[PDB]
Amino acid sequence: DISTLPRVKVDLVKPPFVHAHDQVAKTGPRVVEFTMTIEEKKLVIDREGTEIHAMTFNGSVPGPLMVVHENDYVELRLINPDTNTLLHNIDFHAATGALGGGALTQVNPGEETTLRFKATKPGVFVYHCAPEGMVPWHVTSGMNGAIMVLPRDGLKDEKGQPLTYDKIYYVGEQDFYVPKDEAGNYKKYETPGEAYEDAVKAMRTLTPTHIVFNGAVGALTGDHALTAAVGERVLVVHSQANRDTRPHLIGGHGDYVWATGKFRNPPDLDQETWLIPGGTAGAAFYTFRQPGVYAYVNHNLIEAFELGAAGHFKVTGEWNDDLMTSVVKPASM
Amino acid sequence: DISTLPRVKVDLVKPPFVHAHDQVAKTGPRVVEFTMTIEEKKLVIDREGTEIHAMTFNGSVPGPLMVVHENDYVELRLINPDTNTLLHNIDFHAATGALGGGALTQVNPGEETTLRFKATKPGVFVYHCAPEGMVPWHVTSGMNGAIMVLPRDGLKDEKGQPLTYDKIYYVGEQDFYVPKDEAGNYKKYETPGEAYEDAVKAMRTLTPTHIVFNGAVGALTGDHALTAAVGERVLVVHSQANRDTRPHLIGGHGDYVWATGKFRNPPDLDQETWLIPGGTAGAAFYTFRQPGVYAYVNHNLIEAFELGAAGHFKVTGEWNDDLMTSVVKPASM
Amino acid sequence: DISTLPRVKVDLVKPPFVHAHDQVAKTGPRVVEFTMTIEEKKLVIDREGTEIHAMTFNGSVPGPLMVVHENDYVELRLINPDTNTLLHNIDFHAATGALGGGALTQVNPGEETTLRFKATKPGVFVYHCAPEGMVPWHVTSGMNGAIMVLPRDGLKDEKGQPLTYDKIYYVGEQDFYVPKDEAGNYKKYETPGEAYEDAVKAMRTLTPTHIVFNGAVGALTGDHALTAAVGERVLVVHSQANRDTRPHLIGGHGDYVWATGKFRNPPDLDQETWLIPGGTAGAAFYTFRQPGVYAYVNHNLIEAFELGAAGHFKVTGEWNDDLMTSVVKPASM
Ligand SMILES: O=N[O-]
Ligand SMILES: O=N[O-]
Ligand SMILES: O=N[O-]
Ligand SMILES: [Cu+2]
Ligand SMILES: [Cu+2]
Ligand SMILES: [Cu+2]
Ligand SMILES: [Cu+2]
Ligand SMILES: [Cu+2]
Ligand SMILES: [Cu+2]
């Protein structure tokens, strides 16, 4: 009887950060209430000023990470304000039935809906918009995010022993297909609807023009680098709603990796690089052992360094010369 | 001594259906006899009437699924009628030696051959045509299928316990590279040989024009949807002879997944999406828990909804409001 | 205290061969000393005479395979002779900190450096050049290789039992992006620097012009086929620093496969084809059971047979008619 379960409302936070939560569940099953507002908005995605009409959950690309525990009920209030122009909905890969909820959550501008589903399988899952007849357009305009369903007793390693993270970050990776003129310059449009016919032709080339973390080239660099300290245990959740990616921590590893993101499976150990298939969320666990700057990249290095799929970690702490040292610094022969 | 083993002839059925078989072997090892006839034929692959010269095993794209048990002998009679125009052969990824049998089964039009091999490894495997110097042309013209080698005691879960399916379907996914004129219209040809020079240039772009299930856009939709009922256990075998795919059941999961298709390995649990590498067959096991329409897609959603890699399941039964319910139906604010 | 550990200098050998080593460690941890010399050189990569300016470690594409054991120290002396024209460095995916060593090993022409790192995780790992601002250019010009970190007690199967190989081969797979004129002919350049601006535009198409084993179309065919005998146990190490690949032994299998290359994980059994993500090294173990010619391919068959990713094994021994036999040789009906 759901009417008698505890309820908690959770306010979401913008990626790459994650709303507060417990790793090991301290309560029994609950109804966890979320609210998301759809926002169509102009987004500048690179240094040259290329702009697109993004379709977002809660104003960000990716949408925010939701965190619940196995056999909680997720109750999502989805709002499509009348300032938007398109029909939207939501499909949870975590949910069972009605096309992940997409068949029940179709909202025109000016409408809202509330969906409830039981989170019966633990793991990280993609959620995304999927309206009849324009599914890839909405997904590749940034309308996707992820939900994490933790086991009620938290994460465990390949031997059943507890894994506790000190920090969690959510990296949503987005392939964009910006239409081009004949010389190769990017086009701009006044409304999403104006872009639609060109967007379909741009998608059919299967060649992204940009592949970005957190909605823009360089979004997770500089002042916006992810932070940690030597000795801290970090969980990196990574989603790609449409296209394969192969994350890699330059200078580190994935100590424990759920490449396809499902926690009833044992993790893969000591990964240098792992494949997250398009339409999947994965998670990697790493304990930092050296300070300094790390890059976190899609290890198709063209996609990383030419098309935008690269971010930074800045890690504080003491350098360990046993793990690595420069014996002879670069010098002339 | 093979001369003293029992023999059974099996008549194949057209995909997505699968010929009758036992999951748990009731006999000892047998010689299982199959006959396949090669057919080159014109195929209409989309709604706009695009036609190609398909090269098929037994008249279908994909070729039919063969089912045997571990350490059976597969005896294939391969017939190339004199109405065809090209040399053909067959390479079983399930077989050991002679390029999977391709070096022993080269038949010109008007010829036949009989190959026997021992099915020493359990799993689902690709088979495909592979003639010297024109391997990708034949494969990407649809000349590929799959063979399933069940363990003699049937499928088992990650804990060694029996898994029994009530229904099995075979989805063969095909990337096509149809040559285009300079405006982007598809070309048509009178014979396969006329197409050859353009086909090689179309393949070298590495960009498919169509990606389809069961040989055509929409082949597994509408009246041809796959069917099941709530409570039924379904095994979906999926093959891709040439290109990576990432299947996903919209509204469901892969409860047990052998993404690279080899049954001596434990399955991956609770997958939302899984990667089947080009040149591989995989299998997913799911128990339907909600009725309604499901879509089964390659979760590069451009490949699914723009290029053709999408099919339907229609599932009967009672809706379970505990798993999912619309609390507030879409309404105006 | 490193000053008191034994030291051994190892001279590297050209791929596909591997320098002599012990599978089970016979000594305690050691400092293993390697020397590599960078060589920028013109390379002919196909039958039509297409030439590129390769950037190599030790004069080969890929760079040589280094073999050490877990918790050895790797001490690399890296030399950039003054006959080269570009800055180079090295990033070991096996190493922890300083961008895998890339931040510590930047050498201009005429400089050298010596890096030491502890090999704390067993597996096969990529190493590659990665200079600030031109990472994919150097990697896709061939400046990548692999290092194998064996467990001190050797390789083990999925049940913990010893796996011993008789032969080991290293196949480095390289995607090249050769710039083209408007008719599609490949361009040639006098120096690497002349090529740079066109190379970036060629890479951004994400479409390789060539995909080769051991630096050239046909490099591992003919007289340069890999060799083995029936009954021999062969380990094939395969790396791809930039792009996914899906290796397949035509006529064989991967009996034990570490597709993402990390030996603390149990191997996948009986693979027909396996996915090595871009930026990863994998390893497959196979016992040959039939003599004859085998092809070893990337099983995107367009990439294999049109773009160059195919090599040969020639295996001696006695044919086993129990595994495969031609019952009726190809004959006219
Ligand atoms: O080592 N990451 O390119
Ligand atoms: O949720 N399948 O797009
Ligand atoms: O069976 N390898 O194409
Ligand atoms: Cu939408
Ligand atoms: Cu989806
Ligand atoms: Cu054929
Ligand atoms: Cu094959
Ligand atoms: Cu370099
Ligand atoms: Cu790297």
Side-chain angles (χ1 to χ4, degrees), chain B residues 294-315:
Chain B
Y294 295 67
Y296 180 76
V297 302
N298 170 341
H299 208 295
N300 181 311
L301 298 174
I302 304 169
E303 300 183 356
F305 292 104
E306 294 295 323
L307 300 200
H312 291 159
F313 269 92
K314 292 173 172 53
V315 184

Side-chain angles (χ1 to χ4, degrees), chain C residues 141-152:
Chain C
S141 297
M143 209 160 176
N144 61 85
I147 174 162
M148 180 161 69
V149 183
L150 288 163
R152 288 186 45 81

Side-chain angles (χ1 to χ4, degrees), chain A residues 7 74-79 90 101 103-107 111-117, chain B residues 321 324-333:
Chain A
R7 299 186 154 252
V74 173
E75 193 160 296
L76 177 75
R77 183 180 175 214
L78 182 65
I79 302 166
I90 188 156
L104 300 176
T105 56
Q106 299 176 88
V107 278
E111 292 185 330
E112 73 172 80
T113 186
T114 295
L115 174 72
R116 179 165 66 231
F117 72 88
Chain B
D321 282 303
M324 180 175 296
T325 195
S326 178
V327 182
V328 171
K329 304 184 171 183
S332 274
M333 314 193 264

